[PDB]
Amino acid sequence: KPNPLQDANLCSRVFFWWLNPLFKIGHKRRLEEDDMYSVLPEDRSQHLGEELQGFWDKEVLRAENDAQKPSLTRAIIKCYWKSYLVLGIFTLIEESAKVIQPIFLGKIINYFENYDPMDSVALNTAYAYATVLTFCTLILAILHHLYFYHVQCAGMRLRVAMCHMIYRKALRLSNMAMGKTTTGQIVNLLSNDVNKFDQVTVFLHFLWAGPLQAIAVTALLWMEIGISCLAGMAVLIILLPLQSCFGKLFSSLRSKTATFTDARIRTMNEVITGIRIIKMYAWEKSFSNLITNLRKKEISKILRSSCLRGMNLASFFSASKIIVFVTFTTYVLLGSVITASRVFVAVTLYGAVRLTVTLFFPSAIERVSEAIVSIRRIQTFLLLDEISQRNRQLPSDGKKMVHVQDFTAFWDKASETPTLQGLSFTVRPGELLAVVGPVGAGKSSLLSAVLGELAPSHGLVSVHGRIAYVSQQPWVFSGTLRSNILFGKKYEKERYEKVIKACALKKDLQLLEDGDLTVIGDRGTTLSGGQKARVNLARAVYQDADIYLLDDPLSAVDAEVSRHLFELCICQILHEKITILVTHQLQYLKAASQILILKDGKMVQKGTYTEFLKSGIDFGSLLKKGFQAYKNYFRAGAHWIVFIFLILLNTAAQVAYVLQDWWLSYWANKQSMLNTEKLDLNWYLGIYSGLTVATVLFGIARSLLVFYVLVNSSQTLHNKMFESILKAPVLFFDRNPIGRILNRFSKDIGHLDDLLPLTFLDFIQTLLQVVGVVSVAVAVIPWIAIPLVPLGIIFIFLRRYFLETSRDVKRLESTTRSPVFSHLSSSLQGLWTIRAYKAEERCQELFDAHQDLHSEAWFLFLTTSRWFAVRLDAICAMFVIIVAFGSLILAKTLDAGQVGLALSYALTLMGMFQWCVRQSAEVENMMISVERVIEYTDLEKEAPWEYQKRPPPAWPHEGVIIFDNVNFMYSPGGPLVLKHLTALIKSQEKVGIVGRTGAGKSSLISALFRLSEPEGKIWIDKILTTEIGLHDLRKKMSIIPQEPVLFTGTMRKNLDPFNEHTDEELWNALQEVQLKETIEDLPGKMDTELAESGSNFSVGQRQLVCLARAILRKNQILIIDEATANVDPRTDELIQKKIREKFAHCTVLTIAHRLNTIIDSDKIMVLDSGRLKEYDEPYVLLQNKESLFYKMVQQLGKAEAAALTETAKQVYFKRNYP
């Protein structure tokens, strides 16, 4: 994929002309990883990594020679100064130009100040000065981009080399260091601490071109306006600390919101997760109250932080006005006079040095501090203790064989008992050694010592040959199954087909789409544990070393395939292979040609299976121990009157900005047309200060008002969205996962709260400044309106042409970045397997090929943005040229003030135009947040919580519940679930439910609570359920859910969230489940704050809590579901006895998976695949041998069925015959 950057000229590499073809393709179709362009040979990850590693090794070597700490920063500087001195040369040129061009502005204006139409010599000199002005702006606009590319390229190169050394080191970490670190800490300095290098370079050069320029400019100012410059200059310096006390006060209001944003997001997580429980309990007004309180207390801090941000941005807007105003007030007051050449040079000098001092120099300071911190982190990571490379082997005679003598080892230099105690045994070719021992013996550590991963303390280990190893936990990397097996070995058809058949892989391959070519990412997302183990075994077989180690291979797989693998591969294929096995299944020990027993780190006995049969020790004995979106985003914030006032306030701010400099222009003109006489100073300074103050106040007012309106729009959108997600029917929560729903509450509203109202105000600010500049140049030279239409059409078409590719290549440098982190993860988790094979260097090449695929989209993201900015500055330079020259070919009409104003504003168009366009892109990029928030504010809604027909207070009087032809569906057009459900429930009876899993057992609760408005009728005490609103239907029915949940809060809440009960009642209820005592030993009485789902509580305890809830509600209906799944039998019978003897006079339906739970129930639904068929007393249904109840009783067993039938008969005979 050749790179046209390689075959291009200089006249082609300045205008990035090599990149037009890609853009053309980008205009037709979408871009893929083929359309991309490969990288230069001077940028492949391997080359940079090798070079920087060379310098880093030299530097640490000299550190050892000198006994002082090695510094990575010195290595980076030593490898990169020779190539970062060139870019310094050019930024020196660029700063000199930004300082020179005001002086030629001065000379042009000075020609206008002494206009004489006949002195054509002066006209020719002024034309020369304008030509020099356009040369300066054309080296500031066209040759500043073949520079910025390389300044970002030095940062790219540094970062890619750093990533390569980081992976290289993390591939050879000693286990002692490996354990003390993590694998989240070795991806956090490759995803977030090696990105700083992509940015520090961009600004590094301003640590010396920042101050130097701020002196050069000062000197120039001194030559023109004299001492007064200091006055103005003083103010500029004050913007350095004031900018860093809007930062150590905004960072105290921005990390005092996380303690509220995260509370709200966590409460979201609980509300969205357990929404079926909240709806069934009819609680969501409580969570609505909680979330309203949290959201209001984060809007307080969002509103303070945004008011402060707006004040900062208005200071940035009006700083230039205040500098110029104080400069020229001091300039005039010391007794000098205003002429139009010094005024509009000094303005431009202040423009340049303000853009450097207040914006670029502090940014470079921040970014160099961040890159130094990151270099320190990678510095520490590169000094972790390594692994002894496999050293000079003892001279052998070609006998591949394993022998260990008197081996003792520790995993810690502080452990008392050694991991191994003097182990001395061996294995030869063809001898399938095996290890037998319960968990805690050290067999895993035994194989680890075999691999050398455990440092020998005494004895000796002699392993001579290629080693194939299998970890206890199978490990799969990002790649296809054939590539998974090959692990770098070239494919061989027969040697792979025998692998396929001996591993019994055919079933799994026929399951998946690509046969054996299905791509398997990290953690085996496309595989199962048995598949992982089998593919790991296949890798071990195909790598085909001498000595093989197999640790617990067959435990997690089926018996037959495990037998096949052990017999026709381990017993058969490996009978000619050195092998060590750690096992847990006894049947295979007969096939072990040797047996090793390990215990307490000490050898117990070695021998064949026969000698341990004769030993008298059975193994088991040992083994046991669009535009509409903008309109909706703006309508929410305020009514349109405030919006029209907002527009007038923007316009007043901009117009007063422009009119201040216009006032200097008019002042200068009124000084020229003079004469001693003087000029009335009080009037002029009065209006000058009036215009400056109007600029400042209108800037502050515009910024605060825009922030307030957009923050208020965020608040209104969130309140609407949330109060419309609490009312969405559970069907919606089923369609959308928990991840996406709670993503538009944390990330999206996360934008809408603090990044639209800042990007959308910055965009408005600089857009109105661009319009200010263009309208000044059109009010002076009206003819400019003609060429400036072919700089509107060209601009719009340019931006369309460019955003159709900068949106196809700013997703390629994102969807090819993750594979780097994924490969790093998959290689650290499989680390022992990798380092067991001598092929760790091949994983280095895989990392590079995953890093020459992100440094291949960073290349395009760095040069397509430049192909855009070169052209934008061609447009801005055409404008500056037209203003500079067209101000002369019409010299007869203009004057010094008009020309100064028009020209210096055109000079500031540079850069301001580009920031305006960049924010336009970013705002159109973050209105997707608003589009999603507004997509949720328009969801479905279940029936309203209240109806006109409120129920009688005593209702339900008894508990009569009648199902009349209830036909219920989960979703429209789906399978009919309950079909003609016609049943009667007379007061207080206990009705079990029987059926198949999902055959309608758990749908009766779904329809009875109207979780999906059912078809049919349900009468609760002769009242239709559909005819009453929900919270007058769910408040009057209790339920015991499958998995109880406790909602984060005081235990006073998880029982009485509405504060409708009193401490005596709560204590009594908790007593009825006998857990009252179990609570009154916690820090608080009830008010112990809890973790998720009451993690300090047990499942049985949670069930007790919900049973207490049911007791507290004391309504005369009740529904139980999945009483005890795996709860301990004591708590089982506990809950059972409270279930009967607590709720005798409260109608009970029970939906249980077992029979003893429901054997004694008064009646039983029988649900036949979504159909009620049998419903009567259990004894009657057992009388008929053909009843499904009889059949499913008989399916348990003989003694079980006899006991159950006896119990049902006992109930019948005690009940119906007194």
Ligand SMILES: OCCN(CCO)c1nc(N2CCCCC2)c2nc(N(CCO)CCO)nc(N3CCCCC3)c2n1
């Ligand atoms: O109203 C100023 C807002 N801010 C401060 C907010 O944090 C701001 N930040 C910039 N940066 C952010 C990212 C790291 C530092 C730069 C930045 N960068 C450029 N440049 C890149 C143009 O594409 C010039 C360098 O090429 N130009 C800027 N202007 C803005 C318009 C008037 C003056 C030119 C500018 N402004």
